[PDB]
Design a protein around this ligand. Structure first.
Ligand SMILES: CCCCCCCCCCCC(=O)SCCNC(=O)CCNC(=O)[C@H](O)C(C)(C)COP(=O)(O)O
Lengths: 76, 83, 51, 168, 247, 18, 74, 80, 251, 48, 70, 109
């Protein structure tokens, strides 16, 4: 409105139209993809698949934890 | 956009025209329902309600009864930001 | 749009009329076909293993 | 890859919530929808490997509450029931985010609205993928908090505040 | 207020853990139902009283009485979850209550009023304060993810294994604690401004923002990874519970 | 430029620092 | 929104807290009737005794009704 | 109808405990293609129809069995 | 299975209904709408599919789950099973009534809407239209595309996710030992509901005088419209009681 | 609408007779003709 | 017009000060005798006996004599 | 005069009672065509007593009328969305004027 133009918020406030919002949006997209990198490696290292799938799956490429929990008497 | 004064006056005129007892020949934007056109006050309420239904307005009951003339209702509708 | 004593109703856009007609039509064709194959079965006249 | 399914709406919610002043209505709408959409594509693939492929997934991150025998942890369970819920939550949410891109076009506070949509989806994902009652409890409270934030989104309306407090 | 509620309140419950409970183990058992009754009455009664308070600081201060009497319930359960939960809630309360007193102090420094009815609609003029106020409001409702949920649930676990009835009455704090916390937040921050009462505002400055940061980091840290604290407490906690018996 | 100022402090004179 | 109303009269004690056409106890009387519908139907389900009118015998499973497969001692 | 599928065979086909009836033998080839054909309704129609024929006869037999029991309660009642 | 089905058609009904609300300048009352069967072809088509899928019209997404539920509740020979079968079956007549009442009053009756409302109508743009189309496809085909997967006799899709003891399996008997009249009960009630909705909303003009002259008929209308007075009793006897305790007793 | 009030409102609602705002109950089933004929053409094709 | 401090309202402030001085208006009425009797004495006693009985039921459930308390 | 003001007050009550009763009528009837007849019968009820001259009879006729409207009032009346009690009321309202935002507050000097 009127005073809201002098109010700072993280979400931008009412009717936020930053001039460079496209270059900002793409910089955000590059950042999130960068953060999605360590998450994927940690997930692939932490995933556990006790059963071999009936058919090959995308995860039989990046994940090496298939059919490893068969000796569950040794779990500790 | 806003609705011009002319449109408020003319649409208000047609609503007051469409009344059976009112003859559509002496309806000017300054006539009075109970004095010029010869209606009962209950007739006026029906005119107000049909004015509400034309512009989709909700007049409060206190202000609605104050409307006794064509000119009055024209000003009320024009000054309304939601008409 | 077509005007009639003050009120104006704009014609709906062509692909909105087409898509609405088509999707319902696929649904009617779906129902008539499934009634052709399963109507007898659900009505109890026959069985899936009959033959 | 499975962690990306759960945490992608969180990152999208975080970017539009913390940096919505640099992205605006358009950028925040793009960011939260794309992160939720990619999480929806990976849900279809997880449904492929777990339900049709009949291969379940188990992921443990770290202990959460370990006190003697009490063993609440940050752990994820993906079986047929989970991936069926995963498909329902992410697919319908992707469509609602897209739908909101146009439905909330004229609202003054769209970037915060999209932020709340994505944080609800993340809590709903935490709920259906928890491998323990406590991780389920966290997403049970998170969807209630997110529902509260969205019911009174128009915080000036007295009727919205009454309903949101009632819902909580 | 920060010192009074964050530190000074802990001296009594610390005195129960350091002296009364270990030194007199038979007396502790005979008095456990008595402790359970007083604690459970206080949680229910003082939470309902908090609902009807009209002063910002009176609401926050009345909230501490309910939280400390949950702490007494856990520590007199005399198991690992009860005592460990009681200590964790002590520290978490010393952070959440202090921060909530800090939020109200921010408002009172500018406007010099504590009456709830004068405020309202502060989200449109103080969004940064409103966001921080909401987080600590959530932490006062024992929301999972915050530090206070860890202490609250671990106490309810410890109380359930001793007396189911006291655990059920204590768990009513979840319903009542959420009622006044959200009512306080909405009446202050949500709604419309009242320019006849207040028309001049200022969000948090650089000093006020820095003050809240260690509080935010503290509650999230203990909320999601309380193992750093529970690791350093369990041996002392275990020996406190085992004190006085030899089987 | 954004609306308002971060933490409600007016920026210093151009070329200077806070 | 437009203008909050500044008090011009003393405020009541229960002012911090302050269903139009039906009274209080009358509403409870009506609602108990609706809950009485659910109780009445439950009793009819008791008197129907659909358990005494089952048209097939209970299933009997092989291998001692799956004793070992259900966790019974081999 | 006698048991044909042994305990090991049903355990090896990971058969739901509720489906270890007398048609467990016809379920194994039906489930084997269901995984193989992505559980599509317009596949395995042959293997599905043999299995459904089974589970229908088992119900009819237990319906016939209860008919005899129903016909014996009346015998007791009229001989009261 | 019914949860998955509900997601596709309830989202269609809500997202389609939102498109109507946007087009009618945030008008949400059905007593001020009427017409729009031609003015909104895509929205009416979407609401038609979802509402027909909701009531359990045959071979749509809603028919493959709901009808099995009423058939299983019949096959349960217990006190609770007989209770649910009655209440479930009577409810399918009531849902069909309110479903077509929405269809009839919003788009098919002569317009009761305002002049300025119909002068500013517009149909859904692409970011709103595409999800509606997708949800329509899911409301026609998923129910059929997934029946054998989730509820097929003996299907192992669920693996170890869901457990049912052998003493509780009743699926086979539901589809083989039930009278054919049971497998129709929903459509008898659904058809009756469509007919009663059409009668009250389009050929009835004095079924509203009883609500204005009879105290009992007036009170019965208020009972059902005000949700059995559930909120009021809770507020008057429970919420107010705890609020009054906090000030007058504990304080 | 025999009475004064009644006929007055009948006069006000003259716009409601719009060609594409009335007879809205003959639009109850979009694509019914297309779907029926598409079934017949399939039906003749199945015969062969 | 000036100053951040709130514009005090005499009726809101009288409302506020009335609450802080409630102990001045306390008169031993029949209502107060009943409230203090029911909710200051009776209800705490009922809760205490329910808690003690909960222990005693655990005692007999475990084949042990009732635990003395207080 | 006093009798004119007293009778003018009685006129205002009756006019408002007619206005509310005629809006309640459309809530029950919904459809336009049903509303036309139900509108005439209600006006035909105010016309029956339109000529009563006794001032104390007017007060009893009003009081009986007001309780009638209050007894058979539609339990869920229609409200224009932006009108008070409407679904759009208080949604994104215009910010009030006279609001000031202070910078540089709480400095150490
Ligand atoms: C569901 C809702 C139920 C319906 C509610 C039914 C309400 C009861 C209707 C019957 C009660 C009455 O007649 S109420 C009594 C009405 N009779 C009088 O007031 C005396 C006449 N005096 C006059 O001045 C005018 O004729 C006057 C008509 C006032 C207009 O005033 P104007 O000079 O300005 O035209």
């Amino acid at each position: 409105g009127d005073f809201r133009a002098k109010v700072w918020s993280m979400t931008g406030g009412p009717n936020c139209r930053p001039k460079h919002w496209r270059r900002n949006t793409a910089i955000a997209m590059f950042g999130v993809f960068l953060v999605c990198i360590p998450i994927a490696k940690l997930s692939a290292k932490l995933e556990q698949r006790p059963h071999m799938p009936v058919r090959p799956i995308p995860s039989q490429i990046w994940c090496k934890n298939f059919g490893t929990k068969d000796d569950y008497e040794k779990e500790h | 956009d806003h609705l011009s004064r002319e449109a408020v006056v003319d649409r208000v005129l047609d609503v007051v025209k469409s009344f059976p007892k009112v003859d559509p020949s002496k309806v000017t934007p300054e006539v009075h329902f109970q004095n010029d056109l010869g209606l009962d006050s209950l007739d006026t309420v029906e005119i107000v309600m049909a004015i509400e239904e034309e512009f989709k307005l909700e007049i409060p009951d206190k202000e609605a009864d104050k409307i006794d003339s064509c000119s009055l209702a024209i000003e009320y509708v024009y000054n309304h930001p939601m008409s | 749009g077509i005007t009639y004593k003050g009120v104006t109703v704009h014609t709906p856009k062509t692909w909105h009329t087409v898509t609405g007609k088509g999707l319902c039509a696929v649904m009617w064709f779906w129902i008539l076909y499934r009634a052709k194959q399963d109507g007898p079965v659900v009505m109890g006249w026959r069985h899936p293993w009959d033959g | 890859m499975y962690l990306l399914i759960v945490f992608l709406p969180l990152l999208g919610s975080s970017v539009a919530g913390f940096f919505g002043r640099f992205l605006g209505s358009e950028g925040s709408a793009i960011m939260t929808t794309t992160c939720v959409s990619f999480s929806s594509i990976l849900s279809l693939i997880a449904f492929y490997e777990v339900a049709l492929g009949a291969s379940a997934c188990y992921l443990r991150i770290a202990p959460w509450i370990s006190s003697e025998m009490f063993d609440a942890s940050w752990g994820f369970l993906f079986d047929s029931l989970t991936v069926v819920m995963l498909i329902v939550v992410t697919f319908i949410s992707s469509l609602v985010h897209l739908y909101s891109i146009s439905y909330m076009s004229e609202d003054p506070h769209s970037p915060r609205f999209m932020c709340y949509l994505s944080i609800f989806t993340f809590f709903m994902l935490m709920l259906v993928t928890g491998d323990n009652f406590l991780q389920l409890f966290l997403g049970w409270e998170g969807v209630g908090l997110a529902s509260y934030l969205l019911i009174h989104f128009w915080f000036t309306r007295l009727q919205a505040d009454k309903a949101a407090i009632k819902a909580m | 207020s920060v010192i009074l509620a964050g530190i000074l309140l802990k001296f009594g419950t610390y005195g129960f853990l350091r002296f009364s409970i270990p030194m007199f183990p038979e007396a502790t058992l005979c008095f456990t139902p008595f402790i359970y009754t007083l604690s459970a009455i206080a949680i229910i009664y003082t939470s309902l009283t908090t609902l009807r308070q009209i002063d910002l600081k009176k609401i926050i201060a009345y909230s501490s009485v309910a939280h400390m009497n949950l702490v007494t319930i856990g520590m007199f359960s005399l198991n690992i979850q009860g005592i460990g939960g009681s200590i964790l809630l002590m520290l978490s309360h010393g952070l959440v209550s202090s921060a909530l007193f800090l939020c109200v102090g921010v408002l009172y420094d500018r406007h010099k009023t504590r009456l709830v009815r004068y405020y309202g609609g502060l989200v449109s003029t103080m969004p940064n304060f409103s966001t921080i106020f909401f987080f600590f409001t959530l932490a006062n409702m024992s929301l999972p993810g915050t530090s206070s949920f860890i202490g609250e649930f671990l106490i309810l676990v410890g109380a359930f294994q001793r007396n189911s009835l006291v655990a059920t009455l204590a768990a009513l704090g979840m319903i009542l604690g959420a009622a006044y916390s959200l009512w306080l937040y909405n009446r202050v921050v949500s709604g419309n401004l009242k320019p006849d009462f207040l028309h001049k505002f200022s969000d948090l400055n650089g000093r006020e923002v820095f003050i809240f940061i260690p509080f935010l980091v503290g509650l999230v840290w203990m909320g999601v990874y309380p193992k750093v604290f529970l690791d350093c407490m369990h041996t002392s906690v275990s020996n406190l519970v085992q004190h006085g018996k030899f089987h | 430029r954004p609306k308002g100022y971060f933490m409600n402090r007016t920026p210093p004179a151009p070329g200077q620092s806070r | 929104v437009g203008k909050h109303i500044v008090p011009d009269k003393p405020l009541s004690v229960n002012d911090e807290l302050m269903a139009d056409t039906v009274g209080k106890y009358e509403a409870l009387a009506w609602l108990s009737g609706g809950l009485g519908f659910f109780v009445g139907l439950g009793l009819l389900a008791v008197l129907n005794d659909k358990a005494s009118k089952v048209p097939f015998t209970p299933r009997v499973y092989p291998y001692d009704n799956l004793r070992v497969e259900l966790g019974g001692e081999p | 109808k006698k048991m044909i599928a042994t305990q090991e065979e049903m355990s090896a086909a990971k058969i739901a405990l509720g489906s270890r009836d007398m048609c467990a033998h016809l379920l194994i080839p039906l489930n084997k293609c269901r995984q193989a054909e992505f559980y599509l309704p317009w596949k395995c129609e042959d293997e599905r129809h043999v299995y459904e024929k089974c589970e229908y006869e088992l119900v009819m037999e237990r319906m016939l069995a209860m008919k005899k029991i129903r016909e014996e309660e009346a015998l007791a009642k009229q001989n009261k | 299975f019914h949860l998955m089905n509900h997601a596709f058609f309830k989202a269609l009904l809500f997202l389609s209904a939102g498109s109507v609300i946007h087009a009618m300048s945030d008008e949400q009352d059905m007593r001020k709408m009427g017409g729009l069967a031609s003015s909104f072809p895509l929205t009416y088509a979407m609401m038609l599919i979802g509402s027909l899928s909701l009531i359990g019209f045959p071979f749509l997404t809603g028919f493959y789950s709901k009808d099995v539920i009423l058939e299983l509740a019949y096959t349960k020979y217990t006190i609770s099973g007989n209770f649910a079968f009655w209440l479930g079956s009577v409810s399918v007549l009531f849902t069909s009534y309110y479903s077509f009442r929405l269809l009839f009053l919003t788009f098919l009756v002569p317009t009761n809407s305002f002049g300025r409302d119909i002068s500013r109508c517009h149909d859904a743009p692409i970011p709103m239209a595409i999800p509606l189309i997708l949800l329509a496809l899911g409301s026609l085909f998923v129910g059929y595309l997934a029946k054998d997967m989730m509820i097929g006799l003996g299907t192992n899709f669920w693996a170890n996710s869901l457990l049912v003891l052998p003493k509780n399996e009743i699926l086979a008997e539901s589809e083989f030992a039930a009278p054919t009249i049971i497998k129709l009960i929903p459509i008898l009630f659904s058809t009756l509901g469509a007919f009663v909705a059409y009668n009250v909303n389009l050929v009835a003009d004095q079924f509203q005088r009883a609500f204005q002259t009879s105290t009992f008929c007036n009170r019965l209308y208020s009972f059902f419209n005000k949700r059995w007075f559930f909120d009021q009793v809770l507020n008057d006897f429970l919420v107010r009681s705890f609020l009054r305790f906090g000030y007058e007793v504990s304080f | 609408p025999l009475g004064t009030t009644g006929e007055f409102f009948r006069r006000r609602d003259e716009w409601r007779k719009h060609p594409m705002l009335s007879n809205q109950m003959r639009h109850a089933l979009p694509g019914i003709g297309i779907g029926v004929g598409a079934f017949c053409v399939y039906l003749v094709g199945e015969q062969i | 017009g000036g100053g951040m401090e709130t514009n005090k309202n005499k009726f809101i402030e009288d409302w506020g000060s009335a609450r802080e001085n409630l102990e001045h208006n306390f008169r031993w009425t029949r209502r107060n005798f009943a409230l203090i009797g029911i909710f200051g004495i009776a209800l705490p006693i009922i809760v205490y006996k329910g808690i003690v009985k909960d222990f005693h039921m655990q005692d007999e459930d475990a084949g042990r004599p009732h635990r003395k308390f207080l | 005069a006093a009798y004119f003001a007293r009778r003018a007050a009685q006129k205002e009550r009756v006019r408002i009672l007619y206005r509310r009763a005629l809006k309640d009528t459309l809530n029950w009837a919904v459809h336009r065509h049903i509303f036309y007849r139900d509108a005439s019968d209600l006006r035909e009820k105010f016309n029956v007593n339109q000529d009563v001259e006794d001032v104390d009879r007017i007060d009893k006729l009003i009081a009986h009328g007001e309780a009638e409207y209050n007894k058979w009032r539609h339990p869920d009346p229609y409200i224009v969305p932006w009108a008070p009690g409407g679904s759009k009321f208080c949604r994104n309202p215009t910010p009030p004027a006279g609001i000031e935002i202070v910078y540089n507050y709480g400095l150490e000097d």
